[PDB]
Amino acid sequence: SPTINFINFNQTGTCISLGTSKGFKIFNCEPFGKFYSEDSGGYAIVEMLFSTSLLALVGIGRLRIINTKKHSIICEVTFPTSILSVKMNKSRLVVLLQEQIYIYDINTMRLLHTIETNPNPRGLMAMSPSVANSYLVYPSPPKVIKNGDVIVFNLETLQPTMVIEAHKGEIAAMAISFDGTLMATASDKGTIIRVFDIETGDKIYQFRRGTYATRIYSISFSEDSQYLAVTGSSKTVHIFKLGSRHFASLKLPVETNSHVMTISSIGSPIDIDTSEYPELEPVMKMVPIRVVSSDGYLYNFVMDPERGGDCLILSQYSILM
């Protein structure tokens, strides 16, 4: 049975990306189905555009970009050190190494600017997916107090904008709103979650997670920037309303192994019936929540945006089959 090394949604939450030890696979969420998969070789990093049949492909052990609808190679470039993580927009290319970060235009593929960054073995970044507010942020720890410094960078103008004293320690997890107005960061202790307004840098929401310090894997904003989701080694997913303590609680089933990396995302609100699902009026709106885990399973949840609390489990598909 194949193992899996990477999980990430698209920029909208309508697809599933994966690179396996024997290939890669891409999926869709609402009308569950299989688009594409190749059993070529091992891989490390996979990312997508807003669909458009373009893939970011990295070998497990260079960057290769492939058009799946064309089954052909668009371009290919080499880097000195091992690649760690990238994300995509409609106007720029962003790639990071442990001490270097590179930026390119998506269309013409030519290089634009190079920034020599401090060591980031974890390699956590955050970049807007919108053109008119294209902003990218990376941590700036001092070269071994002021440990939690982040740099606010504009891909349209290729210049730094502002510096924020976000956290007291090393940076752990970052995400940026769909419209690029908000950015949230995670400390190593994971007790304090802070999200800011990008243009002014003023802190707007300060959040408390859990009781004892646990690591934080990743976080993700919603399309309307109303809710934020957190994933950690406590196998528990907490959401925080952006409209303190956690608003509502997500609990993965017991049979799931604890040492799992899990990625979550938030979609547009939906209306569902109360008849088929014993939630405990025919229709009242529900917010869908999707969580895909590195153990190889998908889960569907529904969110009550007044009551909060535990969310009921609806259905679970099993990936790789």
Is 81-208 in the same CATH topology as 1-78?
no
Amino acid at 105: D
Positive or negative, the CA dihedral 218, 81, 114, 104 is negative
Dist CA 47 CA 9 (whole Å): 8
Task: Tally helices (H) and strands (E) across the chain.
Answer: 0, 29
Count of Cβ atoms closer than 10 Å to residue 290 Cβ: 20
Of the CA atoms within 13 Å of residue 163, those in its CB half-sphere come to 7
Phi-psi region of 35 (alpha: psi -120 to 50; beta: other; left: phi over 0): alpha
Amino acid at 113: H
Give the helix ranges, DSSP H, for the chain: none
CA torsion 38-39-41-47 (nearest 10°) is 30
In terms of residues, how long is the chain?
321
b/e sequence 180-208, b meaning 16+ C-beta within 10 Å: bbbbbbbbbbbbbbbbbebeebeeebebe
Dist CA 204 CA 214 (whole Å): 24
Dist CA 12 CA 266 (whole Å): 9
Positive or negative, the CA dihedral 280, 285, 287, 288 is positive
Contact of 76 with 85, CB cutoff 8 Å: no
Dist CA 129 CA 11 (whole Å): 7
Closest Cα to residue 251, out of 232, 279, 276, 272?
232
In the 8-state DSSP scheme, what is residue 217?
E
Contact of 6 with 84, CB cutoff 8 Å: no
Sole residue written with tokens 């492939």? 66
Contact of 152 with 161, CB cutoff 8 Å: yes
Contact of 78 with 59, CB cutoff 8 Å: no
Dist CA 45 CA 56 (whole Å): 7
Closest Cα to residue 173, out of 152, 155, 150?
150
Dist CA 248 CA 130 (whole Å): 29
Closest Cα to residue 135, out of 55, 197, 207, 202?
197
Strand 111-116 with 203-208, pairing: unpaired
Dist CA 302 CA 308 (whole Å): 11
Angle at 198 between CA 197 and CA 199, to 5 degrees: 100
CATH number of the domain located at residue range(s) 1-78 in this protein: 2.40.10
Closest Cα to residue 118, out of 196, 77, 171, 193?
171
Stated as kind and residue range, the H or E segment containing 87 is: none
Q: Domain segments of the chain: what residues?
A: 1-78, 81-208, 212-321
Experimental approach: cryo-EM
Closest Cα to residue 216, out of 236, 244, 188?
188
CATH pick for 81-208 out of 2.130.10.10, 3.90.550.10, 3.90.930.60, 3.90.1150.10: 2.130.10.10
Closest Cα to residue 10, out of 21, 32, 33, 26?
26
Amino acid at 185: T
Dist CA 306 CA 284 (whole Å): 11
Contact of 83 with 45, CB cutoff 8 Å: yes
CA torsion 230-234-237-240 (nearest 10°) is -50
Which tokens in the block code for residue 46? 């996979």
Dist CA 129 CA 291 (whole Å): 21
Structure's resolution in angstroms: 4.8
Which tokens in the block code for residue 38? 């190749």
Which tokens in the block code for residue 24? 């890669």
Which tokens in the block code for residue 187? 């400390």
DSSP for 284-320 reads EEEEEEEEEETTTEEEEEEE-TTT-EEPPEEE--BTT
CA distances from 154 to 161, 194, 235, 238 (A): 7, 21, 35, 31
Contact of 310 with 251, CB cutoff 8 Å: yes
Dist CA 269 CA 60 (whole Å): 37
